[PDB]
Amino acid sequence: RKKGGWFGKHRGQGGSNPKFENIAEGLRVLLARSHVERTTEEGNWVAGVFVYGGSKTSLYNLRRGIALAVPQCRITPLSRLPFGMAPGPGPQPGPLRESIVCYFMVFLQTHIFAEVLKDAIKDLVMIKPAPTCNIKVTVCSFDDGVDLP
Amino acid sequence: KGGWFGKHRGQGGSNPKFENIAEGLRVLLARSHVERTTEEGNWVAGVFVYGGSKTSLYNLRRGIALAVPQCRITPLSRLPFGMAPGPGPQPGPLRESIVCYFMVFLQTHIFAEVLKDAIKDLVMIKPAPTCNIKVTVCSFDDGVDLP
DNA sequence: GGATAGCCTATGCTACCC
DNA sequence: GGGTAGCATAGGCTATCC
């Protein structure tokens, strides 16, 4: 029985469906309690949200969800994390060595909404079963902003 | 002519090309012997590098790894679009461009600043596309728990 | 809503060209 | 040291499973 190959939707062209819509609605409810400004007139991307861990699929679905809930943001594809510190006095891994742990980046126009978005993702995720509850989120601040093309 | 050389993702070593870029960086980083590590060892800061071209970004990445053993670096990935100009609707948050980026993780913000300065100065005397590479210092409120 | 199959195509990697 | 070729294997995407 089926199970897909090519569906004519390229990188970044993801549509919607109940699964991603339901995730988005979870975010929207939380976000609606904090009705803060998500845009500025200048429109620069001065803040971000760095999301990682859990599992590839759970991260992916979260990314798809955020996208539907927040048209005012911009989101990278999933990518991978390098390793952290090795314990003890020994040698460390090279800076390029990559792990199995994924991450994605959300860009935002206001610092205020970045904080709220971060809170919402945490709360959305903290009550769900593993691996989704293990998804970590941190606000990310850009000194000079980012010139998204 | 190359195909498979046995080197998987993240395993890249060194050669004259990358070491040359690394030495350029080392000289510049030597302008400011600030602390690059903490006792706690948390990844609280970074630099966000993007633009130029795929290859010039890539080569920079390789060079930084050789010049800065104390950092950790993502693979290259892609940027989503910004604001669309004028009358049209905005692109979806997921739509991706051709512009690449990578992230460097650091344990101190003070060195992030120096690393950024180093990259800008390293790149501004070069021709396009490399001179068009953009850098910003990056700060993680709650840090990043790199595996 | 997480995990997977399976086409498309992205990057990581190296050595070659110049 | 920028652009490339070309294997390996990342992810984006979907429907199907359950």
Description:
Chain B: The active site is at 58 (for site-specific dna cleavage activity). Chain B: It is found in: Host nucleus. 2 copies of one chain form a homodimer. With 149 residues, chain A is an alpha+beta fold. Chain A has a single domain (1-149), classed as Alpha-Beta Plaits, CATH 3.30.70. Helix content of chain A is 31%, strand content 26%. Chain A has helices spanning 18-33, 56-69, 111-126; strands at 45-53, 74-75, 79-82, 98-108, 135-146. In chain A, strands 1, 2, 3, 4 and 5 form a 5-stranded antiparallel β-sheet that branches. Chain A is globular. The first copy, chain A, starts with 17 loop residues before the first helix and ends with a strand. The interface between A and B is large, with 55 and 54 residues. Chain A binds a DNA duplex (18 and 18 nucleotides) through α1 and α2.
